[model samples]
Target: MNIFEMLRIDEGLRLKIYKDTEGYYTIGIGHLLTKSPSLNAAKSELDKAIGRNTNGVITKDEAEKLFNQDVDAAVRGILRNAKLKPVYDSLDAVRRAAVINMVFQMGETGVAGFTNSLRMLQQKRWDEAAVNLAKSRWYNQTPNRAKRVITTFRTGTWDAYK
Candidate 1:
């Protein structure tokens, strides 16, 4: 229903560091370790949040903080793109979340590569936008999540995945 809840379910939770599908060091709801200003800063924060040295484990509360931070960055990144900002602003909440979800996984520059799809979306050509999304390596690599996101684009409803 909310971006946080939606991503929490989609990304899953983890108390310890793990390698992501791309083999990046990841933690707590898809937080890429390298994306932090400094790896030690990130680790220290997590450790302090749990009131111990932690040895790499984080509490659910700490994970939630990182998730919120990541989601906020994703949203800001999407809005900061000049070409995408207006399109993103024109969308309804669910459709906006669909865009945010894509950015959350792919990053802003990656999503920006979908120029044609974005053009279609801006025109409210939902089916065409979905079609374009389906044609990507992104879709091929993660079809399940792609299908849900594409359906959300097409239907403008959060129930697409449910």
Candidate 2:
């Protein structure tokens, strides 16, 4: 098999958010092994597993390489949406991070649909914005993550932040 096809033979096994992730994992593009772990879709769960100067089935170099590639792409995503005119440009870093988190969570266009919340944010309506966010499907689907973004704007503080 060619390198691309052969690569699939190993770790690109594509576990979804629900998988125990003991077998293999996927990054940007791959299969959804189920509605699979502790694996936050961003793979926050995976970080701790590999963070302690330990190794996994993948090598240290490979893991860090994959992680950097993943983060770079996410940063690009943030940049694209941050160009959303005055609304995106005017926010402070803490508020901006909330939007960044939301963009990554729901996807660029998906977060784009949060026009009211975004507008409320520009208007400095923290209470209203949080209310708008807490009422949404995204919040229901991932309360842990959604709450952090909600809190970020609610306090507008980098400390104790997500």
Candidate 3:
């Protein structure tokens, strides 16, 4: 299924998918909106989120509401349809899902830009991957979020409700 189908954001939802003043897609979610930090920022967030979370379970209700129910599915669709399928296929299902989760939280291009980390994953270098994941500017910018997701990544579990 395509992103719209996976996200379940039918045309009826009338969700506004437009670029912000800064040129990022401002996905209108109810009264509160969540946007990709510039297109560049969006990709960074997605990479971190997915790398750190395995199940693709998002705890942020506000964030989820932005895409309706198809958020996870939509994310999976993007991975399935990406040009980096060969790289993606090298990882485990859990890791793939984790990456997709990150993209869901961040955005596709954001996750795709993790050159070093992606290389580590490609080499099956877990420790280095973890380190690279933690070293991200994205992590420094959002320490609380980074810590929470890192814990989830290490533990392979997280509470669905906060």
Candidate 4:
């Protein structure tokens, strides 16, 4: 599966995923994976997995080369258990691409944490979803990135391939 199909995340959630992962795991502006060997190798492995999954489109190959056994297994487990299918079923192509991006970055737990936001979206609470999305720590910390995703979600005009 492609990144979006595999994750089943929506654009808003995808943006949140990117922000959270980037803040915690990346080093530079291009979302380069941090090479701090002291923080354990799991983050590094995850970084690698994300890089390969996106075919170096969203991340770098140097990061992907760090995959370890534990991190690889954990990532697989998260993807296997993800409730992405339902989320995917609910969204259009643009929104779906956004979700996939987030899930790829954040994993199952991060996507699951959007309980209220998901519920709001399920209820077609467009404004509420947008507001709730903006209210997140994810949004507060990564305003530029979060705003981009939210804008695409609101307008439904985002081009995933771009």
Candidate 5:
């Protein structure tokens, strides 16, 4: 598996700017679109998503390029774990994205224990699969993002939050 491919898989490839888990301005595969120090760093980012042209704001093409450049490290983070590789390689594309997101947050080791959920995925039982996903330490820890992933699996939807 190539480094760039894994990076794109785990990050899930959002083409637009969006608020991340902590509500920071982010875009394109977890790129923090801020240059301000205000959040203890005076960060500033391209506010174009909200319709404003700024000096540092990146175009969609720039964002994609940034992701490719920065994603190697993130991909390696997953690759270092032998256990996560099979788990990642096992799922179908839709379900794979959900699983990759899980690994990104929960750590590959943390999510590897979803045996039942994986079996559900094998059977194409989206609802049951997600229900199993919900019944986890990871879910209780990050219910909102977790549910978003679960909902993605549950309904086979993408960009559901936007």
Candidate 6:
């Protein structure tokens, strides 16, 4: 499946505000409202997408627009990291999707912190990369998803875990 499809499955679609595992206010396919640098910016987009100034509620169409924006940001964020550019480019579509999925959830810096894992991925050492990925608090935090992502890296397949 493509990156967007993968995200839809993993992030899920939330029409209203919900607290994340970290207790951050999030909505519309994992948009972190609480952590947003400019709540006004996001809120404005939300309003514009729904064509209303109602409470921060959003329709599915609006949510799709927001999810696309977030996915774009995550892609650019991943590419913005110089070291990740070549590694990201070297990966196949499914592997790239996995990387983007991780970035979507953790932010660029959080994924960047996986130095050894990135290094292993850079060298095309799939098993090693999976091992390094498993050796993290992130793995423990979302063990099921983490296992799926790691399995994706290991096998270069979208539904590897399943």
TM-score of each: 0.87, 0.59, 0.49, 0.54, 0.50, 0.87
**Model 6's TM-score against the true structure:** 0.87
Across 34-103, the per-residue lDDT of candidate 1 in tens digits comes to: 5555557667755655567877788888888878888988988877889779889999999999889988
Task: Please state the error at residue 107 of candidate 2 in Å.
Answer: 1.1
Report how far off residue 137 is in candidate 1 (Å).
Answer: 1.0
Candidate 2, residues 3-31: lDDT per residue as tens digits? 22222322243223223233334442232
Q: Could you list the CA RMSD of all candidates, in the order they appear?
A: 3.2, 11.5, 11.9, 8.5, 7.7, 3.0
Q: What is the lDDT of residue 74 in candidate 6?
A: 88
lDDT of all the models against the reference? 0.83, 0.55, 0.50, 0.51, 0.60, 0.81
Off by over 4 Å in 1: 35-53
List model 3 lDDT by residue over 1-162, tens digit each.
233332232212323334543354443331113364454454344434335431212334434554554464545656575544555688655455455555655556777777777777777776667777898876886566555545434433443112
| Candidate 1 Cα lDDT to native | 0.83
lDDT of 4 at 140: 85
Q: After superposition, how far is residue 33 of candidate 4 from its true place, in Å?
A: 5.4
lDDT of 3 at 75: 53
Sort order, TM-score high to low: 6, 1, 2, 4, 5, 3
Model 2: CA > 4 A from native:
1-57, 82-85, 159-162
Tens digits of per-residue lDDT, candidate 6, 1-162, equal: 788877787778888766677766677888777555455665665566567884777789878988898899888987888867777999898899998999889988888888888988989998888888998998998888888888889998766534
Q: Which lDDT tens digits does candidate 4 get at residues 21-126?
A: 4344332222324444333343444446554333223332332333233234434544465465565567777766556455545556777788887776656666
